[PDB]
Amino acid sequence: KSPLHFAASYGRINTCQRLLQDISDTRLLNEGDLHGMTPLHLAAKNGHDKVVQLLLKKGALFLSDHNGWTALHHASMGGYTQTMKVILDTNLKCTDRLDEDGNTALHFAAREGHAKA
Amino acid sequence: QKYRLKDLTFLLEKQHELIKLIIQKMEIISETE
Amino acid sequence: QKYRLKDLTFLLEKQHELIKLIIQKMEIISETE
């Protein structure tokens, strides 16, 4: 739990591939820390598209933390267009999610000034 | 000085990318959790 | 403040060189491709 969060948060991909072996218990994959942020949230927050792709290939459900944000909210707040493009080719249903204040991902991408996002 | 500041920003962003690469490639053994 | 900005640029360039040296000397074992 603690190692996987670090490895995903800093893009250490081989550590993630090693930890995510013997795929049978998805309780470790979709479990958030104290702020309720799953590994997918962290990997997208720091903008590591390869880790996001690897986690999605195992299925990560797109949950929500203690502020209603999703992976796309973080990726847009940061401005990483590549991980956004990776996310937008899977379920295609998270584009219009809302946090605690009814903000979409577009709200954040525009507030922070990321034109390409 | 505006031009100088823009060049400074560009260089700092390249440096930030390099540092993130360092963190994602380094060895961690004794200080693991 | 122009003089100050020039000194800042000089220091940042030295730092960038040091970081590139770190990357080219470090150990990479578990995170190799």
Swiss-Prot record, chain A:
Q: What does this protein do?
A: Ligand-activated Ca(2+)-permeable, nonselective cation channel involved in pain detection and possibly also in cold perception, oxygen concentration perception, cough, itch, and inner ear function. Has a relatively high Ca(2+) selectivity, with a preference for divalent over monovalent cations (Ca(2+) > Ba(2+) > Mg(2+) > NH4(+) > Li(+) > K(+)), the influx of cation into the cytoplasm leads to membrane depolarization. Has a central role in the pain response to endogenous inflammatory mediators, such as bradykinin and to a diverse array of irritants.
Where it sits in the cell: the answer is: Cell membrane
- Please spell out the taxonomic lineage of the organism that makes this protein: Eukaryota, Metazoa, Chordata, Craniata, Vertebrata
Quaternary structure, per UniProt, is: Homotetramer. Interacts with TMEM100. Interacts with EGLN1. Interacts with the scorpion wasabi receptor toxin at the same site that electrophiles but in a non-covalent manner.
User: Related disease?
Assistant: Episodic pain syndrome, familial, 1: An autosomal dominant neurologic disorder characterized by onset in infancy of episodic debilitating upper body pain triggered by fasting, cold, and physical stress. The period of intense pain is accompanied by breathing difficulties, tachycardia, sweating, generalized pallor, peribuccal cyanosis, and stiffness of the abdominal wall. Affected individuals do not manifest altered pain sensitivity outside the episodes.
UniProt protein name: Transient receptor potential cation channel subfamily A member 1
Instruction: Summarize the PTM comment.
Output: TRPA1 activation by electrophiles occurs though covalent modification of specific cysteine residues in the N-terminal cytoplasmic domain. Hydroxylation is required for TRPA1 activity inhibition in normoxia. In hypoxia, the decrease in oxygen concentration diminishes the activity of the hydroxylase EGLN1, thus relieving TRPA1 from inhibition and ultimately leading to channel activation.
Originating gene:
TRPA1
UniProt free text on domains: C-terminal helices from the four subunits associate to form atypical coiled coil structure; this region is probably involved in binding the inositol polyphosphates that are required for optimal channel activity (in vitro). The ANK repeat domain consists of a convex stem structure formed by five ANK repeats and 11 additional ANK repeats that form a crescent-shaped structure that surrounds the protein core.
Concerning its family, UniProt says: Belongs to the transient receptor (TC 1.A.4) family.
Please report the residue spans annotated as repeat (ANK). 1-28, 35-64, 67-96
